């Protein structure tokens, strides 16, 4: 038999800190790095999908997941938590669609998912998610790129990085990237900022990329990623 712990596992320290949230953030800043770039006509998400053996079938689990037909996700931190959040986000999107018969705006999805994340920092018997999310979307002509952290807070980015070495990736982005970039150039600089960390030979199966233009979100084929990883195309 079982019931549930009804008290908060996340509490204020005398300094005024929510320690478990910051430890969760520590868990995020220890995971494989991910980059997101908003580029006028589209959005790019990319991440290090580096396995630990040749035995791993990289064609089975993905880090770049679709939420709907126009919204995509990547993460930094713990996998299983991310998976939970993905299911939940998809469900939320579909509820929205059932009520409004209109594809969910990216910002609204971000807000709802963020609310779910906030619940796990105050509700009883649970720890916060050890995951930061990057959410890309196409709605109302414009492109959109958000990030949501374990506290349940979210921010809109033109470009950003999370995970290991996210600070240097962030600076690299601040210098070697700006607006008026086509999605192609954005993919280029995205693989470029991921390469600022990817210890080893960065192959077409070592990273995963997803795009979001006004034709829908999709994961890039390994072939397309190879062509991009030819330092060209």
């Amino acid at each position: 038999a079982e019931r549930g712990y009804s008290f908060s596992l996340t509490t204020f320290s005398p300094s005024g800190k929510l320690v478990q949230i910051e430890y969760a953030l520590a868990a995020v800043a220890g995971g494989a790095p991910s980059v997101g770039i908003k580029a006028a006509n589209g959005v790019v998400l990319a991440t290090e999908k580096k396995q630990k053996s040749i035995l791993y079938d990289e064609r089975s689990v993905h880090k770049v997941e679709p939420i709907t037909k126009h919204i995509g996700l990547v993460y930094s931190g713990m996998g299983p938590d991310y998976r939970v959040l993905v299911h939940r986000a998809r469900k939320l999107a579909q509820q929205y669609y059932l009520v409004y018969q209109e594809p969910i705006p990216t910002a609204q999805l971000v807000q709802r998912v963020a609310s779910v994340m906030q619940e796990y920092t105050q509700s009883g018997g649970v720890r916060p998610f050890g995951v930061s999310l990057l959410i890309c979307g196409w709605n109302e002509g414009r492109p959109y790129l958000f990030q949501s952290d374990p506290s349940g807070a979210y921010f809109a980015w033109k470009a950003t990085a999370m995970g290991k070495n996210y600070v240097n990736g962030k600076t690299f982005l601040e210098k070697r990237y700006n607006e008026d970039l086509e999605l192609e150039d954005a993919i280029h600089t995205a693989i470029l900022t991921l390469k600022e960390s990817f210890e080893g030979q960065m192959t077409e199966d070592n990273i995963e990329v997803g795009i979001c233009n006004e034709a829908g979100f999709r994961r890039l084929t390994p072939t397309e990623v190879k062509d991009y990883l030819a330092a060209i195309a």
Binding site: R90, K91, Y97, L98
Partner: protein, 220 residues
Amino acid sequence: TTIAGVVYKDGIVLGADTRATEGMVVADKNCSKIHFISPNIYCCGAGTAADTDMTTQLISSNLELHSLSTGRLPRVVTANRMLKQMLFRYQGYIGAALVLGGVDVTGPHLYSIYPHGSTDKLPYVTMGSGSLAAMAVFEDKFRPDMEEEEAKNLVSEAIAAGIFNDLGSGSNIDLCVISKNKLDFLRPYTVPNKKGTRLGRYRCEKGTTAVLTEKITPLE
């Protein structure tokens, strides 16, 4: 309402009329009765309109979730199961009569689904007030393994039979063709029905309506 479905060599042809009646008065001359379920699965709806709408939308949503999780294209059996179990749970109080058709990895599949939750898997089905006429057309001119245009012709013929012989049906004909590698959402197929041209001009000229009160509100 007259809806029909047939199984041909390369897939499935769905057909529907476009009249929506409230009582014995036509409300809609161009009602869409062919609903999206999944990219490979479509559903014609007769019975209580709101119920077919919500049922079909709900199942579409759940199936999108399902395929999103599985990463594969939905199966028709899945749609059939979801629909029939939901409908059985409500004991006929949800007035959804459906023609469900699609193409799978296992091929083309056509089910008819009744509001109580019973289903039938058949090469050709009809539902609605005009279903007996359409069924007559099928039972007279159906052969297995037809070609696309032949099947389209047969279905449009059945829907027409319904249109001209049932007071519940009328207006245009919608077809939806689903094959192993094509989706022809023809809407509408062919309108065998037209309002006669206006003989008169009953146009009222400005000032002919007396006004007691006016109030103009500027916007932005």
